[PDB]
């Protein structure tokens, strides 16, 4: 119905807010987050279905407006990750724009330029908030949803990682400067004697990461321990009640905890794990169980894996002199959604 939408507005004199700018329908549900206009049920359920879905490339996965899986025009800015759908542009901005755009060399999306309006596309007044605001109101089991952050108010990320050194990764992700001194990352291996007072003085935190030691057991400390200490420490790390809230935490397991000692973890962390596998074309090299508050991490789950598989997968590894090489690659991209909250450092 997209070809008709533009008529409806300049002809039947409707108010965009009355046509699902996604699929140009007339049976609206509740207005559209990002741009001026409404949303149909079938269309909304999808908007949700893919909110912070990113890809190896590093950009968002679906159309910023319609959630189309087709080809997408990407922003030319490095602060932006949003991508815009061919038809969407054309159908709402004006005809023959996706042309002009695929033409342009230095493009800046709609949620990036000075002028508020282009064609019929109208970037809401202060959307970012209205977005989350939507999330809550519209999903059926809302989760921790933190308002996003305009490119100019994005201070650097302050991280604390227990047992495992992330640096290398968040570095490659564009989260850390090149200056390895004020480096907002604190690593600490032993915390058995650490008190809430320490953590507090340790400078306030934005992200607390942490994870169990690998299969190549080098440190003798009952797995379940880590789960526990991590938990503790975290509360310390948290912020003084009522403060804004850009606050994220994650705990990872390389299949080192067992059924019991795990059903535990999930109770303390308050969320069923999210096992992420490493593919090799049919085979299965490694895997990783995860816990976190980071935007949509409960979508990158591969129910395509079975317990009885891992149990064995964890047999051919304790059967060699493998290196404690920690399976980074797995989560590296999980952190992507954050690019929308903290400062990014161009390489």
């Amino acid at each position: 119905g997209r070809d008709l939408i533009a008529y409806e507005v300049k002809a039947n004199q409707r108010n965009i807010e009355d046509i699902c700018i996604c699929c140009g329908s007339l049976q609206v549900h509740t207005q559209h987050p990002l741009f001026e206009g409404g949303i149909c049920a079938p269309c909304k359920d999808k908007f949700l279905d893919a909110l912070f879905l990113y890809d190896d490339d590093g950009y968002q996965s679906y159309c910023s407006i319609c959630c189309s899986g087709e080809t997408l025009l990407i922003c030319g800015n490095p602060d932006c990750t949003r991508c815009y759908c061919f038809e969407c542009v054309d159908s709402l901005v004006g005809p023959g724009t996706s042309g002009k755009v695929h033409a342009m060399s230095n493009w800046v999306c709609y949620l990036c330029l000075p002028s508020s309006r282009s064609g019929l596309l109208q970037r809401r007044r202060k959307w970012r908030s209205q977005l989350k605001a939507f999330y809550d109101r519209e999903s059926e089991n809302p989760l921790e949803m933190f308002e996003t952050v305009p490119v100019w108010r994005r201070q650097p990320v302050r991280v604390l990682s227990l047992f495992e050194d992330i640096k290398k990764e968040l570095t490659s992700l564009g989260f850390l400067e090149s200056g390895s001194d004020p480096g907002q990352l604190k690593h600490v291996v032993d915390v058995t004697d650490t008190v809430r007072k320490d953590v507090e003085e340790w400078g306030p935190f934005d992200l607390v990461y942490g994870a169990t030691p690998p299969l190549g057991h080098t440190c003798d400390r009952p797995p379940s321990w880590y789960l526990f200490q991590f938990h503790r420490l975290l509360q310390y790390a948290r912020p003084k009640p009522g403060s804004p809230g850009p606050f994220f935490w994650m705990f990872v397991d390389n299949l080192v905890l067992n059924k019991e000692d795990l059903d535990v973890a999930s109770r303390f962390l308050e969320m069923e794990p999210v096992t992420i596998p490493d593919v090799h074309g049919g085979s299965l090299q490694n895997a990783v169980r995860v816990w976190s508050n980071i935007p949509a991490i409960r979508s990158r789950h591969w129910a395509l894996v079975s317990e009885e598989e891992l149990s064995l997968l964890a047999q051919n590894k304790q059967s060699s002199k493998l290196a404690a090489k920690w399976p980074t690659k797995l989560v590296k991209n999980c952190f992507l959604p954050l690019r929308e909250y903290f400062k990014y450092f161009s390489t």
Partner: peptide
């Protein structure tokens, strides 16, 4: 612009 499509 720059293009891209994912599965």
């Amino acid at each position: 612009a720059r293009t891209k499509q994912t599965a």
